[PDB]
Amino acid sequence: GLELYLDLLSQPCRAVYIFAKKNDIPFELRIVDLIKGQHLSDAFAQVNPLKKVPALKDGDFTLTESVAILLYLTRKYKVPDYWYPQDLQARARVDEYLAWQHTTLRRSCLRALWHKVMFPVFLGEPVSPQTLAATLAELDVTLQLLEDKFLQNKAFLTGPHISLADLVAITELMHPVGAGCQVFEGRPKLATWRQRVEAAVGEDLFQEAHEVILKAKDFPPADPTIKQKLMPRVLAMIR
Amino acid sequence: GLELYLDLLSQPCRAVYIFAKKNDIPFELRIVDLIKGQHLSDAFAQVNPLKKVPALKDGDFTLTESVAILLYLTRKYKVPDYWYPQDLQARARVDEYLAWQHTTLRRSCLRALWHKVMFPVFLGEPVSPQTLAATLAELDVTLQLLEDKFLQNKAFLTGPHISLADLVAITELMHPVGAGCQVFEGRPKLATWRQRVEAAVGEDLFQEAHEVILKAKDFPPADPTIKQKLMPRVLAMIR
Numbered sequence: 001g002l003e004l005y006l007d008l009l010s011q012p013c014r015a016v017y018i019f020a021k022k023n024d025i026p027f028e029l030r031i032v033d034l035i036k037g038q039h040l041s042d043a044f045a046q047v048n049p050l051k052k053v054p055a056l057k058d059g060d061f062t063l064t065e066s067v068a069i070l071l072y073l074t075r076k077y078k079v080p081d082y083w084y085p086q087d088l089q090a091r092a093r094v095d096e097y098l099a100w101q102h103t104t105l106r107r108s109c110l111r112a113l114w115h116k117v118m119f120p121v122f123l124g125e126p127v128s129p130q131t132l133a134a135t136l137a138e139l140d141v142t143l144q145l146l147e148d149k150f151l152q153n154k155a156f157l158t159g160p161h162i163s164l165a166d167l168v169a170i171t172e173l174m175h176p177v178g179a180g181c182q183v184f185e186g187r188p189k190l191a192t193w194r195q196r197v198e199a200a201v202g203e204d205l206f207q208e209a210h211e212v213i214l215k216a217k218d219f220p221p222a223d224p225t226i227k228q229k230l231m232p233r234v235l236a237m238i239r
Numbered sequence: 240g241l242e243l244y245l246d247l248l249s250q251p252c253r254a255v256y257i258f259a260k261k262n263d264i265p266f267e268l269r270i271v272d273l274i275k276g277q278h279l280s281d282a283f284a285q286v287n288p289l290k291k292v293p294a295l296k297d298g299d300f301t302l303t304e305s306v307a308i309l310l311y312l313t314r315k316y317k318v319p320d321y322w323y324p325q326d327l328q329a330r331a332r333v334d335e336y337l338a339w340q341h342t343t344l345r346r347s348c349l350r351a352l353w354h355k356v357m358f359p360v361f362l363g364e365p366v367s368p369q370t371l372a373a374t375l376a377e378l379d380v381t382l383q384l385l386e387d388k389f390l391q392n393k394a395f396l397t398g399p400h401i402s403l404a405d406l407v408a409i410t411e412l413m414h415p416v417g418a419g420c421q422v423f424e425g426r427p428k429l430a431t432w433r434q435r436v437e438a439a440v441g442e443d444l445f446q447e448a449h450e451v452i453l454k455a456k457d458f459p460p461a462d463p464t465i466k467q468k469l470m471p472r473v474l475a476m477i478r
Contacts, residue, residue: 050388063331065338072331088314089300095307102341103478149288239478 002027005047005055007034008212011110012066013054014171018201018209019070019164023079035122035219037226040233051233067098070164082161093158097150097165101172108142109175111135111238117179117216123231124221139176139183147189155196162200170197171209178213241266244286244294246273247451250348251305252293253410257440257448258309258403262318274361274458276465279472306337309403321400332397336389336404344385344411347378350477351415352455361458362466362473378415382426390432401439409436410448417452 004020004027006013020027032038032053039051048055048064056063056072063069074084085091115135119125146169150157157165173194176183184191198206222230243259243266245252259266271278271292278290287294287303295302295311302308313323324330354374358364385408389396396404412433415422423430437445461469 050384061328063335065335067338068331068334071334072327075327075330088311091314092300092302092307092311095310096302096304098338099304099306099341102338103346107342107478145289 001058003030003057004028005030005032005044005053005057007032007039007053008209009034009216010053011106011171011175012168014174014209014213015168016054016056016066016069016073018171018205019073019083019167021205021209022201023073023077025073025077025079035222035226037229040229066168070167074164083164083167085159085163090159094163094165097157098168100149101168105142105146105169105172107238108135108139109172112139112176112181113179113213113216114234114238116176116181118234121217122219122222123227123234125231136181139181143173143183143187143190147187151189151193153189156193162197166193166197167201170194174210174213178210178216180217240297242269242296243267244269244271244283244292244296246271246278246292247448248273248455249292250345250410250414253413253448253452254305254403254407255293255295255308255312257410257444258312258322258406260444260448261440262312262316264312264316274461276461276468279468305407309337309407313403321398322403322406324398324402329398329402333402333404336396337407339388340407340411344381344408346477347374347381348411348414350374351378351420352418353473353477355415355418355420356456357458357473360456361461362470363460375420378420382422382429386426386428390428392428394435395432395439401436405432405436406440409433409440413449413452417449417455419456 002025004016006017006029008014008017019025032044032055034053038044039053045051047057048062050064052064054064054066054069056069063072071084073079084094112135115127115132119127146157150165150169154160156162157169173183173190184194241264243255245256245268247253247256271283271294273292277283278292284290286296286301289303291303293303293305293308295308297315302311310323312318323333351374354366354371358366385396389404389408393399395401396408412422412429423433
């Protein structure tokens with residue numbers, strides 16, 4: 001049957017996890033622990049040769065990329081049209097955001113988690129104060145774009161209802177939130193939007209999906225072995 | 240009516256250009272000249288507040304992000320099935336590649352062009368032999384992934400027929416090819432793939448869309464004023 005290789009630490013996994021639970025899509029949970037390097041192992045490379053999460057598997061069908069996984073689940077499980085509307089322009093707005101976040105907001109949030117908490121606390125590697133400040137400055141810029149280019153004065157990023165776009169954006173914004181960054185303080189429109197999204201998702205589910213990312217400042221250091229294999233993996237993931 | 244703001248210099252514009260020409264879609268072409276910093280004008284910041292190309296405009300509907308544009312044109316004008324296959328699994332592969340390429344092949348092909356030609360020539364900015372070597376090294380890593388994860392032993396990247404994925408891939412690879420880099424050498428399966436893609440697209444149209452990028456090594460160095468405006472944009476674009 002349907003299997004989902006996830007790790008709620010990972011941003012795209014929370015987006016997929018929330019989408020699957022919210023829509024009651026029956027899947028088998030295969031928790032892949034990234035804090036142990038369980039993704040660089042022989043047992044996981046058989047599943048996904050690229051050694052990454054999220055990963056979907058259903059028989060001989062395998063799929064990577066959360067954007068592909070979400071669209072696939074949307075179509076196969078005939079979820080509500082609001083996730084990805086029939087209307088061509090309304091649907092184009094979801095694609096516009098999904099294509100936009102790869103190199104911008106996803107990149108920012110991920111760098112905020114690693115340059116402010118993961119390297120120093122988890123990897124034990126000090127980060128240049130100049131690199132940390134640049135990372136947070138750039139986080140502010142992408143937050144500003146999120147409001148100016150997408151949210152504007154609407155209830156959600158693509159219209160009056162929640163869509164795949166809102167789902168991917170809030171799991172992205174929870175990265176810096178888990179790192180101690182003041183993401184919504186000083187941004188009333190994004191704070192209003194956050195409450196509308198977790199209300200549409202269901203507080204229990206939203207809270208459940210974000211338990212590991214909020215304990216990020218509490219993970220113990222990684223022993224010399226795991227750290228040696230994750231270092232080049234992380235450095236390549238956050239540029 | 241349908242308008243397409245493009246510059247054959249940028250990779251995403253070539254994808255949108257070839258898809259619209261090949262499918263006989265009626266549109267007015269608005270050439271945005273990146274070399275003359277026309278995208279940074281106060282009049283183009285009206286069409287797209289981000290000042291980037293490609294940009295689609297059909298009435299009060301404006302759309303950015305090449306992936307969203309390609310998918311939109313695929314629905315608005317109903318084109319051959321192979322671009323974005325109706326088959327659930329074949330379609331997912333297209334989405335998977337379109338999502339994967341943003342932070343990988345798009346970035347490597349773009350950095351290759353700039354460290355090998357655009358910086359030294361067009362911007363009078365020398366690039367250390369190791370910066371170029373690093374960029375060309377990462378390029379192969381992605382060229383390898385392009386074969387191991389997507390192409391493999393198939394005619395095209397997501398099937399026996401060309402899709403939006405192949406169109407985006409070959410327009411991306413034409414950047415390092417326009418830079419005089421080694422791309423299809425030593426890689427016979429990509430070399431074979433290239434000719435199938437050019438033929439599927441049509442050799443004349445493929446040529447036509449790549450006249451600007453194949454003359455990249457001949458662009459006159461931008462004068463101190465234009466260089467000053469573009470310098471931030473460039474480093475922030477090739478991140």
